[PDB]
Write an enzyme that holds these catalytic residues in place. Structure first.
Site, PDB file in Angstrom:
ATOM      1  N   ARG A   1       0.849  -1.187   0.000  1.00  0.00           N
ATOM      2  CA  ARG A   1       0.000   0.000   0.000  1.00  0.00           C
ATOM      3  C   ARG A   1       0.882   1.232   0.000  1.00  0.00           C
ATOM      4  O   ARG A   1       1.880   1.252   0.666  1.00  0.00           O
ATOM      5  CB  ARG A   1      -0.849   0.102   1.262  1.00  0.00           C
ATOM      6  CG  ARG A   1      -1.720  -1.121   1.518  1.00  0.00           C
ATOM      7  CD  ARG A   1      -2.818  -1.329   0.489  1.00  0.00           C
ATOM      8  NE  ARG A   1      -3.567  -0.113   0.258  1.00  0.00           N
ATOM      9  CZ  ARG A   1      -4.293   0.141  -0.820  1.00  0.00           C
ATOM     10  NH1 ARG A   1      -4.402  -0.773  -1.766  1.00  0.00           N
ATOM     11  NH2 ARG A   1      -4.913   1.297  -0.940  1.00  0.00           N
ATOM     12  N   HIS A  11      -7.111  -2.829 -10.225  1.00  0.00           N
ATOM     13  CA  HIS A  11      -6.025  -3.122 -11.170  1.00  0.00           C
ATOM     14  C   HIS A  11      -6.481  -4.081 -12.258  1.00  0.00           C
ATOM     15  O   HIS A  11      -6.625  -5.287 -12.017  1.00  0.00           O
ATOM     16  CB  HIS A  11      -4.857  -3.768 -10.441  1.00  0.00           C
ATOM     17  CG  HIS A  11      -3.927  -2.788  -9.820  1.00  0.00           C
ATOM     18  ND1 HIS A  11      -4.128  -2.261  -8.563  1.00  0.00           N
ATOM     19  CD2 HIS A  11      -2.774  -2.248 -10.279  1.00  0.00           C
ATOM     20  CE1 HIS A  11      -3.133  -1.440  -8.272  1.00  0.00           C
ATOM     21  NE2 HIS A  11      -2.302  -1.413  -9.300  1.00  0.00           N
ATOM     22  N   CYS A  37       1.909  -1.731  -9.880  1.00  0.00           N
ATOM     23  CA  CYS A  37       1.705  -0.927 -11.073  1.00  0.00           C
ATOM     24  C   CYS A  37       0.843   0.286 -10.742  1.00  0.00           C
ATOM     25  O   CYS A  37      -0.172   0.173 -10.044  1.00  0.00           O
ATOM     26  CB  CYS A  37       1.018  -1.761 -12.150  1.00  0.00           C
ATOM     27  SG  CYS A  37       0.721  -0.825 -13.651  1.00  0.00           S
ATOM     28  N   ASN A  90     -14.295  -5.006  -8.382  1.00  0.00           N
ATOM     29  CA  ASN A  90     -12.840  -5.095  -8.326  1.00  0.00           C
ATOM     30  C   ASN A  90     -12.395  -6.537  -8.090  1.00  0.00           C
ATOM     31  O   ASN A  90     -11.681  -7.128  -8.912  1.00  0.00           O
ATOM     32  CB  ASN A  90     -12.396  -4.142  -7.211  1.00  0.00           C
ATOM     33  CG  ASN A  90     -10.899  -4.045  -7.047  1.00  0.00           C
ATOM     34  OD1 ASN A  90     -10.142  -4.989  -7.341  1.00  0.00           O
ATOM     35  ND2 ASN A  90     -10.452  -2.897  -6.504  1.00  0.00           N
TER      36      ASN A  90
HETATM   37 MG   LIG Z   1      -8.278  -5.873  -8.135  1.00  0.00          MG
HETATM   38 ZN   LIG Z   2      -0.111  -2.636 -14.794  1.00  0.00          ZN
END
Ligand SMILES: [Mg+2]
Ligand SMILES: [Zn+2]
Ligand SMILES: [Mg+2]
Ligand SMILES: [Zn+2]
Ligand SMILES: [Zn+2]
Ligand SMILES: [Zn+2]
Lengths: 162, 162
Positions: free
Chosen positions: A60, A97, A104, A118
């Site tokens: 984090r 993500h 990333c 998510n």
């Molecule tokens: Mg995710």
């Molecule tokens: Zn990425």
DNA sequence: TTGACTCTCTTAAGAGAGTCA
DNA sequence: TTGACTCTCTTAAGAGAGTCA
């Protein structure tokens, strides 16, 4: 409160800094037996991370900027979405993500959606395997597949019907 | 308890008690525009729940038996799987509701798998919509669908590529 | 104003154990 | 022995806020 222009300036400084993170090329499953390529902009493993960035947990980070003597801080992946609604259907929006690569910070690999949406991407068959996400997945989810179930449904007697 | 005979006796007592829970019919999406029917054996909403059962959380219960003069206690859905490995690939095995109905204790609606496999069923397209789970789903997951993403991937500048 | 640490919290799929009667 | 409560914990996707120089 921060003005629209000030928020845009925060997003621009964040993009400038993240754009200088190491860019790592990853080959990834797309579903349907096809392979694709994603380019992740990865925050470093240890300090220093980049101007404005600091680690608050194992995976984090937060972004911090001081504006007119006031310290403002955001989750490091939330910055691209500061001009968007922060909830939907009574649920908090989260940075999600699409590349499934926590380090990333490429904003082209992020979307802004409920925590359930998510999480669900982890099991998606992918953009070439049947993804139905309206904001389409960039790859097959890392947990897609037959699974590793140890024991299935079963009874010793006859007390139950399906 | 320790012996296989004692474990079988626990499973048999549990099945007999759960077999007397009210049977509630639920019609469910299967995927592919098809519908099916499940018969859930639902633990009561309030005490008394049944011999050996007690509520430890809003949607959590435990089964307990006195064997060798000692109390043995288990999560209420784990009892069918007492003779199975309690881990897989170094991940804890969990009772996983194929019917997505916490109060149900029908062992024909349960499997024993990692928490990741368990969670992922929430988004499965279902047995008539493309489920690839080796231990097949009984229904389409309740969270399957396009999602409600507020914002997709985007950048303000020209620093990033997908 | 900035960096590098520190701490705890949320969610929704799941758990173990103690206090009384 | 059995019942009916109480409490906190795990995981892996995610969060906010404090301290010091
Ligand atoms: Mg995710
Ligand atoms: Zn990425
Ligand atoms: Mg489940
Ligand atoms: Zn998808
Ligand atoms: Zn059921
Ligand atoms: Zn399935």
């Amino acid at each position: 409160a921060l003005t629209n222009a000030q928020i845009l300036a925060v997003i621009d400084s964040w993009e400038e800094t993240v754009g200088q993170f190491p860019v790592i090329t990853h080959h990834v499953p797309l579903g349907g037996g096809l392979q694709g390529t994603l380019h992740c902009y990865e925050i470093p493993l240890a300090a220093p991370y980049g101007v404005g960035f600091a680690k608050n947990g194992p995976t984090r980070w937060q972004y911090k900027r001081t504006i007119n003597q006031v310290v403002h801080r955001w989750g490091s992946h939330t910055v691209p979405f500061l001009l968007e609604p922060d909830n939907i259907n009574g649920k908090t929006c989260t940075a999600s993500h699409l590349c499934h690569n926590t380090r990333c910070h490429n904003p082209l690999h992020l979307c802004w959606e409920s925590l359930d949406d998510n999480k669900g991407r982890n099991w998606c068959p992918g953009p070439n395997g049947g993804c139905v996400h309206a904001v389409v997945c960039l790859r097959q989810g890392p947990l897609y597949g037959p699974g590793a179930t140890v024991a299935g449904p079963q009874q010793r007697g006859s007390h139950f019907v399906v």
